Design a protein around this ligand. Structure first.
Ligand SMILES: *[P@](=O)(CCCCCCCC/C=C\C/C=C\C/C=C\CC)OC
Ligand SMILES: *[P@](=O)(CCCCCCCC/C=C\C/C=C\C/C=C\CC)OC
Lengths: 602, 605
């Protein structure tokens, strides 16, 4: 009849790894169009959605299970222990000041990796300090860099269909910012290290003068941008150059990057393969090397998923660490603003510039003061060696590719021998509940935000991929949301008891490499909940609970596709995750040059 | 303007622009057989949804939840900032035992007068027996708790107050009451009473766990699936003070009503007028106290279920701050509007029961971080005390929107009496977005209740509920997940409005209900009734304290034409129960309860 639960009294040796993959049809082209109309149809529409929910065990969890826990609507963290060997910085200091403290945590820059080098060395991306050193040594100017970037955008059509990196780009505004930045390097007063650095903002974050469409073709008609967002205003005050708005999966409803209105962004490592969603353009423009870093959102993996598939670094901050004022996902309970950079050094600098909780979340979440990891230290490995790396073996190997489970396993052995890390076995109970509780916790705010727009007639202007998801989200009742928040408390009490034994939780970022794009889906989208969910089977933990996580390249598989490793640490412990990730890049640096790559500084 | 989509703004509205939007609730009044078919239509597949969506479209709820962009981030649970410490109050630790707080609260009370219990002039007025009157008679050996228990049990059996059609209690065991009274009587003979509440009779609502009686919540099957095994937090504290748990009170089924109509156990009748309703959902708790059987009772208040019956029956009900009292061991735990509040015959009794049951849960202590409990110095501690230096907020349009000219003036008489006898300032205020508060409340209370019992109803137990509950559940299943998000966005708007009001005033005074005791239609006694118009009209003042968490209280302030009780509500700042209790104490001084109800039982003789 009904199933009974009790959270804080389960035996961890009793929890069995339940691996239920998602079951949904794979429709493209015309059959997708008719399927969307059947879902939006009156009577038959509700039957198809209730069938999909009961087939995937969601009705059994929300409606046929009594949960004794009280709802935890927003992530609630206890007072954490202070992390060891870190530099505390003020949370309300100017981003120009935090960039200087961060410059002290980085190892000393050596000029032998930019100007003069042996022409028989390996491949590496350009660090932010490589541009900063060249701007200050009068080797190049941000104006000449902007011209070379704009030259590539227009030569290859990366600002127009079918394969764009940016969906809102203005060359005249890029030159306007690079001129004022160049004249500050000539007068001898650069603002900070980020002065002259090109960054790309995702289309769901406000950034003047471009409007915020969120991947749609009509959001600027009902939601006009007034001022810069909290993260862009901080970046702009450091002298950064906003390149433009990035292509994304429509409204973040997808983990592939399919956009049937502007085009599907292609993976720089293989143009016939997806980039990963939803920050598709942000990840591709950084992997291609056009810009140094990019800002994106992550309410279900939209920062780490496209970072692992494209071979870059994506930082997912703690819930509330970065101010979300001025974006489409503000007010949610899983989303944050995270950077996507080519190397760890670049992502750390951007994190130092954009961090800072909002005035509201400061009084509700009570965050700890920000910390910068001392990435360089001649003393013994004080913190790196004394870390316990939690690992769920049955969850670690459940991947659709034997290459990514062993290439991550090689890094763990490399971490234990070259530093002394203890790999502790853990168990993550109720993994199917965390997926069901997450999908409703991400969709309900998104559907509510656009509900007055859809009922006014703008629902037909959405892609078939979004309308299919919104049809499922309308099935979630208010009682279903309450039960999901009660599940969020259970998953919280489990992970808190895990973080008392281990410091981080290492897992592969995705369960597969860069997937192939079916040629029929390029005409109007596709519904593939099986593959969309399969990409989130490792990142839903940090979103639903708010823990900070990161994605780092750890090598490549058989066909040369990037492999991503995830490191999720304690709340507010970005410095712990950043420092550990810095050692992972030291053991397995990015070496393969992607197919679509552009060298700027030359 | 309302053309395509509506657009809002919160912390930038002009309070001089806000105009009062009055009563709007429209719904059918169906009883008997027409009620049964209407329920079958609502539970019918296709036509059931169209009727609900019509009622949501007709009452303007769909335009609020679906056709209005709200520029606020959702506030799921009541968030309060740091409050200014209330003046002239006694601070007591939140960790002390309930017996220790009782001795501290006894110091705050004025000196007891034995000339009001044993020896008095036989030509005086009417007055309820206070808790200290029982404690005096027990300790002076004028009577024992065993003799008092035999007197109460004699009345319950003689008038069938534990049986249909008009019961006060739905779970009553006479053998258990004597068992608790025997142990209480010995402690007075041995000379070691536990506290002042030792020997006092209190009644627990049926949705609160209280051994050995099971918890049904007004239903007839909830004990089959939810069995109680230990006392609740509020009951275990009262039992540690020597209180006598009289039994589980009658209530509206699962708190889904504000009238007290229960077609499974009967409808409890108002002691002032048996042909009239008691007010819900704590119908039995308020009737057994107003009748003089027990000194106090425990009930819930998620939408006025403590204040509404207290005003209709002529007693005092204390709605504490959200999180102030532990709700562990009840059917409403984990909510966002409900609390456990006492219902007593006098302010002195409610203040003592509040001191014994208070105490935030270990989870709510960390998330809400409440200030330490404070007890008001009820005696004349200063002379021209802080009572006069209080600003009373009043919304004149909202104050007078009542379906009876008597309750609007009898409450206005108390305000003039407070200003002349103490010096209170009556500041005019405005409460913006009153219709949004009603919409955001009903979904915030209905969704967790429906989610609590969803596995039981889908297991076939949905047919065993009354038609009144199934009517509400048919509406509650219509609230989508996106509708709940927008409702919490409205909770933040009403919060920023009321917080800016508390920057100017200390409390907000309004009438408790917009009408006196309504008459029970003789057809509703068959299988309940659906009357959302009256069910909502009784909550038009008490929803602000539930959706936002502010403490409120309902105090009798006189009677109307036909001799029915009138209630006045005082809602204060968060965690400021002492401010609300102190001002309410002065109100009972200026207008005490003088009319004896029809059904009344003197216990001490
Ligand atoms: P990111 O953080 C991308 C994260 C993915 C969010 C979108 C997922 C929605 C899935 C679509 C439909 C629902 C899937 C399963 C529901 C249950 C049964 C239906 C098959 O973006 C910001
Ligand atoms: P208390 O704190 C009593 C509070 C009232 C709870 C039950 C009220 C439910 C109302 C019934 C139906 C819904 C009313 C309006 C919805 C909108 C349109 C429907 C016509 O109990 C603990």
């Amino acid at each position: 009849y009904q199933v009974m639960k009790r959270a804080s009294e389960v035996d961890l040796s009793t929890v069995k790894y339940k691996a239920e993959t998602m079951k949904a049809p794979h429709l493209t082209g015309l059959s997708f169009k008719l399927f969307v109309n059947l879902l939006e149809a009156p009577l038959i529409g509700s039957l198809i959605v209730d069938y999909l929910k009961k087939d995937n065990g969601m009705t059994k969890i929300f409606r046929n299970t009594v949960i004794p826990e009280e709802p935890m609507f927003r992530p609630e963290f206890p007072s954490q222990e202070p992390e060891h060997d870190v530099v505390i910085v003020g949370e309300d200091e100017s981003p120009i000041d935090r960039l200087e403290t961060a410059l002290k945590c980085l190892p000393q820059y050596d000029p032998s990796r930019s100007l003069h080098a042996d022409p028989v060395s390996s491949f590496r991306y350009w660090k932010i300090r490589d541009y900063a050193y060249a701007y200050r040594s009068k080797l190049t100017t941000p104006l000449q860099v902007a011209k070379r970037i704009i030259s590539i955008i227009e030569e290859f059509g990366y600002d127009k269909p079918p394969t764009p990196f940016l969906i809102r780009f203005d060359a005249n505004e890029v030159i306007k910012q690079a001129e004022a930045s160049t004249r500050r390097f000539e007068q001898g007063n650069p603002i900070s290290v980020l002065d002259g650095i090109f960054v790309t903002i995702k289309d769901d974050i406000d950034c003047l003068p471009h409007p915020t469409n969120g991947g749609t073709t009509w959001l600027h008609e009902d939601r006009s941008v007034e001022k810069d967002s909290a993260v862009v205003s901080k970046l702009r005050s450091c002298g950064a150059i906003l390149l433009g708005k990035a292509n994304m999966h429509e409204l973040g409803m997808g983990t592939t990057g399919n956009n049937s209105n502007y085009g599907t962004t292609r993976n720089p490592h293989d143009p016939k393969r997806y980039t990963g969603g939803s920050s598709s353009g942000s990840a591709a423009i950084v992997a291609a090397g056009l810009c140094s870093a990019a800002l994106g959102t992550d309410g279900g993996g939209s920062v780490r998923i496209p970072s692992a598939l494209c071979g870059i670094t994506g930082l997912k901050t703690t819930y509330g660490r970065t101010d979300m004022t001025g974006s489409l996902c503000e007010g949610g309970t899983v989303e944050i603003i995270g950077p996507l950079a080519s190397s760890l050094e670049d992502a750390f600098l951007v994190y130092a510039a954009i961090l800072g909780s909002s005035s509201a979340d400061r009084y509700n979440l009570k965050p700890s003061p920000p910390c910068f990891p001392k990435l360089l230290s001649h003393n013994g490995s004080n913190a790196i060696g004394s870390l316990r790396l939690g690992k769920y073996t049955k969850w670690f190997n459940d991947v659709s590719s034997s290459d990514i489970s062993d290439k991550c396993e090689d890094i763990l052995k490399l971490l234990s021998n070259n530093h002394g890390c203890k790999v502790v076995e853990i168990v993550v109970p109720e993994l199917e509940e965390m997926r069901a509780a997450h999908v409703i916790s991400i969709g309900s705010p998104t559907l509510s935000s656009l509900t007055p727009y859809c009922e006014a007639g703008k629902n037909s202007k959405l892609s078939y991929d979004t309308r299919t998801s919104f049809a499922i989200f309308r099935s979630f009742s208010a009682s279903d949301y309450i039960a999901a928040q009660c599940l969020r408390r259970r998953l919280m009490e489990y992970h808190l008891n895990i973080f008392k034994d281990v410091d981080v939780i290492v897992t592969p970022t995705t369960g597969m490499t860069a997937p192939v794009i079916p040629p029929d889906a390029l005409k109007n989208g596709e519904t593939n909940i099986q593959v969309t969910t399969d990409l989130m089977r490792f990142v839903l933990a940090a979103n639903l609970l708010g823990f900070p996580a990161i994605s780092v390249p750890v090598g490549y598989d058989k066909e040369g596709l990037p492999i991503g490793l995830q490191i999720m640490g304690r709340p507010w412990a970005e410095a712990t995750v950043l420092g550990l990730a810095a050692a992972v890049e030291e053991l397995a640096p990015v070496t393969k040059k992607p197919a679509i790559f552009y060298d700027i500084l030359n």
